[PDB]
Amino acid sequence: MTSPFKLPDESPSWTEWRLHNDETQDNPLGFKESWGFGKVVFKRYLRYDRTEASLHRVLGSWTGDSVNYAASRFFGFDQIGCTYSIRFRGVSITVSGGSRTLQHLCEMAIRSKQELLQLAP
Amino acid sequence: MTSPFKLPDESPSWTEWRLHNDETQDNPLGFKESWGFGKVVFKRYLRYDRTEASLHRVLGSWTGDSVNYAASRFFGFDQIGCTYSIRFRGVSITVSGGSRTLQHLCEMAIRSKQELLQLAP
RNA sequence: GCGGCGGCGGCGGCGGCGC
């Protein structure tokens, strides 16, 4: 299937996660995000260290155009449900609606992402 | 039960909603929001016409302090799930997490509300 | 971090019924 994401997954192995735990969510290795279209879900764990360079990098993981290319594989006459989810430091935000509204869903999803990743410590 | 909201509900009757439909979501009468703490959910339909005065009014419907007073009725040793939901013009945003994180949940909820209600037409 | 599992609650599509 063609993914909505433009960066690959970065999930930590079990060992890497333990080591990180032993040496320090709040300062997790990163955040989790996902895009769902009908019954298909695409998922990413991305490293994030709360700097400006890193924020810039992880905001590039999807665009309205990558999301639309991916989602449109699953479109037809009827509307399907589309959902964006992100979780970081104990907070989950889900942006959801029908595919007819995807352009607005992407606009609110990107804003939600930015705000959550910049949440005051 | 003590509500997290500081404005009363404004749900339209069936007739008022029909009339509004016949004379004009996109330009709905308002938006729907809700606060959930464990298994109890409080809900509001509030009128909103996309002006600055109206935005100011509906942003007063809850505060971090009203939410905390309401939610704390349901607190104890274990953590419970807390969720804020809002829907406007075909887009739903849910902000969710545990009660230990309520202060952050309120910060992201208020930002999500503002952004959604100001969504470019 | 990943994969089951059991409860509880919410959210989005879709179809349909009542007011």
Add this chain to the structure above:
RNA sequence: GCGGCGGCGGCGGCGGCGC
């Protein structure tokens, strides 16, 4: 707008199992 209903899929608590 409100109240059922049937599917499908996500999400959050909680408990627990595997790597």
